[PDB]
Structure formats: structure tokens, C-alpha cells
Amino acid sequence: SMKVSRDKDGSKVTTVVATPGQGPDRPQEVSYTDTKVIGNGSFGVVYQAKLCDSGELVAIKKVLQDKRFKNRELQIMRKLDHCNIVRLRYFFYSSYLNLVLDYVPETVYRVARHYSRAKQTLPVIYVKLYMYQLFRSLAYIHSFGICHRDIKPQNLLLDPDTAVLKLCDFGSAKQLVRGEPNVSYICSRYYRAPELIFGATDYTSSIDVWSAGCVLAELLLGQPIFPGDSGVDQLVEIIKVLGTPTREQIREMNWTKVFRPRTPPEAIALCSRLLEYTPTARLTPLEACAHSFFDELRDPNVKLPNGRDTPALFNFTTQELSSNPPLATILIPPHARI
């Protein structure tokens, strides 16, 4: 269980025995301090803390664990190991369930909002950096047949200096199996795919791609691209830009004057190949990554305005490239093969 002592210069210490996020079940003594109720999601409470030894800042999502069954989020995160997904350091139980995750102060939402308020705009380099990493994180979890289902600016954590992004909050994630139906009320408003809006229950993990296209379009526009208090409204906006859907386009369900001027035409192109009525016509995460819009990232001389180097972007895995191995001829740039 957990033991809470107070030593080392007036400071409350919580000690508990938890289980490694990944790896073989081999319990350990984890001691943290400075626990502050930073977040209050819905399913439970989100705590922020400091590990006594490394001093690293972790996050603890305490949700009401039940014995009636396994915890899908825990299960899903228990099998994810990717440089673009929040890391599950440990997990343990309290009288209910606790998820000790990496802590990341900034989010795409907060950054995009900052610039949007200052009537300014984020340098495309970041747009490319962030979107790329998200597409990679999607190719990874998709490779396991897992759909996030709640891709939104707020679930995109990012380190301000390194510029590395990490997808978080898998509380809505589910492995999708053809044949099996799924609730169609799991996505965020401004990022729900038309199918979700049409109440389809046979949607594919490509709804994550639609959302991503929405994040991208939002980053370029300074505001959401398909807002609306209701579905009807949302569809209006979707139609205003994509055009009225054809009968086929619908069955499958269930630009140049949109973005500000002087805005790269590669970015506008990608958006269009991501936001398609036909779910099966949208690019796949790997195809999104190999889009020309991300060519700068492939350049060998590219760096952050910062002067620092870009985070790893080419250390792909067989797991990652499985959807289409041959895409590596574009994905992994020459200099990376030296």
C-alpha cells in the first residue's frame, strides 16, 4: 500500500510500491512529493508530483478503478513504447487506480492559443514539427489496431525547448475490430469526423486522421476550421469547404480561399488529403509523414529557431513502417543513412 512520511526538511513524502509501466511485473519503491491537484478530468483526478530521487515531475491520474473488469486505458498504455506517446512510468492502486505518467507543462492548445490571442501565428517549422510527430504517433498505435478517438490540441503535450510532442490521454482509446461496433460519441466537438457526426458505429481508426487534419488546419488558421454548437452547424462548415457530399461519399460515411494568404500550398494540399468525406480516401499516418509539407524536416541542415537540433524524426521501427514498409525510402532521408 502507500506509506506517507515527512523527512528531509519539512516535506510530505508518499511512498508506495507500484508496477513498471512496461516490462515484466517487478514492483518498486516509488517516492514522490509536492502532490498538487493540477487537474480534475471527469473520470477521476489528475495529480502532479515530484519524484524524490530523480526530481522528475510526474503526473498521476487517479481514476475510480473497478474490479468488475480490466482497465482498458491501463491495458492499452501498458503496451505502448514510442517517443511520441506519453510514457507510463508506473501504476498502482489506492483505496482507486493511479497512473504515473510523464509530466509535460505545455500543450499544443496552449501554444496555439497564445499566438492566436496575440493576433500572431506560429512559425510553420513548429507546425511541421508538431503535426509530423502526431502523425507518427498515430501510425504507431494504429499499427496495433488502436484508435485514439480523442485527438485534440489539448491532448498534444510538448516540451518547449526540445520541441518533442507526445500524444496523451488514452482514456478514450480502443482497439477497433472489423465487424465489431463502436460508440459514436467519443470524439471532441471541433474534431469529430463526419461519420461520428452521422452516428456511424462502424468507423475505422481513420477518424484520428480527420481530427489531425483539424488540428493542422486550426494551427494554420488561428481558430478551429469546423466549429458549431450542433452537428448540423458543424456539417454546414464542413460542407462550405469540402463541398456537398455525393451519394457515394455519404454511403461511405454512415480550400484555396480558406487559409490566410501567403500560406504554403503544401500545407493546404495535405489538409485536403486528410479531410475527406470518404474515410478510406484519407492519407494514412505514414503517408501524412511522407507528404511534401514535411520536406523541410527531412533537410539535413534544419534546426529549431532555437539553434538546437530537431528531435528524432527518422528512428522508425518495423512496427512503425509495417503499414507500408516501402515508404521508408521517403521517410528515412539519405543523410540519415550515413
Swiss-Prot record:
InterPro entries: GSK-3, Kinase-like_dom_sf, Prot_kinase_dom, Protein_kinase_ATP_BS, Ser/Thr_kinase_AS, STKc_GSK3. GO terms for molecular function: ATP binding; beta-catenin binding; dynactin binding; kinase activity; NF-kappaB binding; p53 binding; protease binding; protein kinase A catalytic subunit binding. Its main location: cytoplasm. Changing L97A: Abolishes activity toward AXIN1. It comes from the Eukaryota. The modification Phosphotyrosine is found at Y185. The active site is at D150. It is found in: Cytoplasm; Nucleus; Cell membrane. The keyword Nucleus applies. Phosphorylated by AKT1 and ILK1. Upon insulin-mediated signaling, the activated PKB/AKT1 protein kinase phosphorylates and deactivates GSK3B, resulting in the dephosphorylation and activation of GYS1. Activated by phosphorylation at Tyr-185. Phosphorylated in a circadian manner in the hippocampus. Activated by phosphorylation at Tyr-185. Inhibited by lithium. One of its GO terms (biological process) is negative regulation of protein localization to nucleus. Expressed in testis, thymus, prostate and ovary and weakly expressed in lung, brain and kidney. Colocalizes with EIF2AK2/PKR and TAU in the Alzheimer disease (AD) brain. Residues 32-294 form the Protein kinase domain. PANTHER family: GLYCOGEN SYNTHASE KINASE-3 ALPHA, GLYCOGEN SYNTHASE KINASE-3 BETA. Monomer. Interacts with ARRB2, DISC1 and ZBED3. Interacts with CABYR, MMP2, MUC1, NIN and PRUNE1. Interacts with AXIN1; the interaction mediates hyperphosphorylation of CTNNB1 leading to its ubiquitination and destruction. Interacts with and phosphorylates SNAI1. Interacts with DNM1L (via a C-terminal domain). Found in a complex composed of MACF1, APC, AXIN1, CTNNB1 and GSK3B. Interacts with SGK3. Interacts with DAB2IP (via C2 domain); the interaction stimulates GSK3B kinase activation. Interacts (via C2 domain) with PPP2CA. Interacts with the CLOCK-BMAL1 heterodimer. This is Glycogen synthase kinase-3 beta.
